[PDB]
Paper text:
Chitin, a linear polymer of β-(1,4) linked N-acetylglucosamine (GlcNAc) forms the rigid inner layer of the cell wall and is also partially hydrolysed during morphogenesis. This is performed by glycoside hydrolase family 18 (GH18) chitinases that catalyse the cleavage of β-(1,4) glycosidic bonds between GlcNAc residues. In contrast, “plant-type” enzymes are predominantly cell wall associated endochitinases. Here we describe the discovery of novel, low micromolar chemical inhibitors of Aspergillus fumigatus family 18 plant-type chitinase A1 (AfChiA1) by high-throughput screening (HTS).
Exhaustive attempts to obtain a complex of compound 5 with AfChiA1 were unsuccessful. Due to comparable IC50 values between AfChiA1 and ScCTS1 (9.2 μM versus 2.4 μM), as an alternative approach, we selected ScCTS1 as a model to study this interaction. Compound 5 was soaked into ScCTS1 crystals and diffraction data were collected to 1.8 Å. Clear electron density for compound 5 was observed in the active site, corroborating the kinetics data showing that it, like compound 1, is a competitive inhibitor. The ScCTS1–compound 5 complex shows the ligand filling a similar space to that occupied by compound 1 despite the lack of obvious chemical similarities. The dihydroindene moiety inserts into the same pocket as the pyrimidine methyl of compound 1. The hydrogen bonding requirements of the Asp172 side chain (Asp155 in ScCTS1) is satisfied by the linker amine of compound 5, which also donates a potential hydrogen bond to the carboxylate of Glu157 (Glu174 in AfChiA1). Finally the ether oxygen of the ligand accepts a hydrogen bond from the Ala110 backbone (equivalent to Ala124 in AfChiA1). Consequently, the absence of stacking moieties in compound 5 is unusual, though it may help explain the specificity of this molecule for plant-type over bacterial-type family 18 chitinases, as the latter group generally possesses a second tryptophan that forms a ‘lid’ for the active site. Binding of the bulky dihydroindene deep in the ScCTS1 active site induces a conformational change in the protein, with the side chain of Tyr214 (Tyr232 in AfChiA1) and the following loop being pushed out by ∼2 Å compared to the superimposed ScCTS1–acetazolamide complex structure.
Author numbering: 25 to 312
Amino acid sequence: ANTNIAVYWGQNSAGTQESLATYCESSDADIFLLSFLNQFPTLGLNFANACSDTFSDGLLHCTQIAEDIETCQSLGKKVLLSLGGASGSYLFSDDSQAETFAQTLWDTFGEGTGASERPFDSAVVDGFDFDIENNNEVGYSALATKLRTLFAEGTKQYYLSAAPQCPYPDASVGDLLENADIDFAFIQFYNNYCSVSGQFNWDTWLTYAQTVSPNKNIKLFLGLPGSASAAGSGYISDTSLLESTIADIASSSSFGGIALWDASQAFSNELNGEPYVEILKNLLTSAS
Ligand SMILES: Cc1ccc(OC[C@@H](O)CNC2Cc3ccccc3C2)cc1C
């Protein structure tokens, strides 16, 4: 597992986004981040065109995504629910509020037995990604830590991740990354000074993993756009640059692989017949 590919799914960056299970059945990706629980602590989900049904109270109710989560899991994929994204319709006032919210997540999305409305029926996520983008850090470390306690009650391994941008420390998930046990850091090396072709600062994140992260086994991911149209800048089509980049970063145990925004883009974008996500997967496997 220096060879994992993580993809965001749910926000249909490419327009042509297919079902979650379609991408799990592909073999080019290992970890799927459902984008997003964009409203909290008062729960709200958004998955663009992939789910429109609701409970009476307006909370999304997503029977096809639920079935696909189960299919994905049977095929050995991990499926995390991603909190946040670009909306900022989310904020904690304090750690206590965020700790209460851990229970809410556990009973709504995990193996908690507390009866609440379950957007994915009896399907159970494999954990949570913290894609916090509003530059407010209150509550996340306490939420993460409480979740770790609750996960012991479950019957499988759960994962927590965060999605910083490359500048260090991150203004939204820096405190989380420094103060809680996190499995994966999906670090965005684009739209920033520290992108791969800018002043690439992998070395800083390595220092973080080795000396700061409460989990010394945290895995770091090279976070990239999945196509030229998936973000404004920092898409890498130069496969020599990708090879050399992977070469440099794969020579520690802290390297986890590559994270992509998003499935729709990375799977549909071809060089020039071959899916971008497949190019990357094979580069990871060669390097290991
Ligand atoms: C329509 C829409 C599309 C994207 C939205 O949020 C997109 C971004 O915030 C994506 N954050 C992820 C976080 C991450 C981690 C590694 C590699 C890439 C990326 C991008 C929100 C809305 C409402």
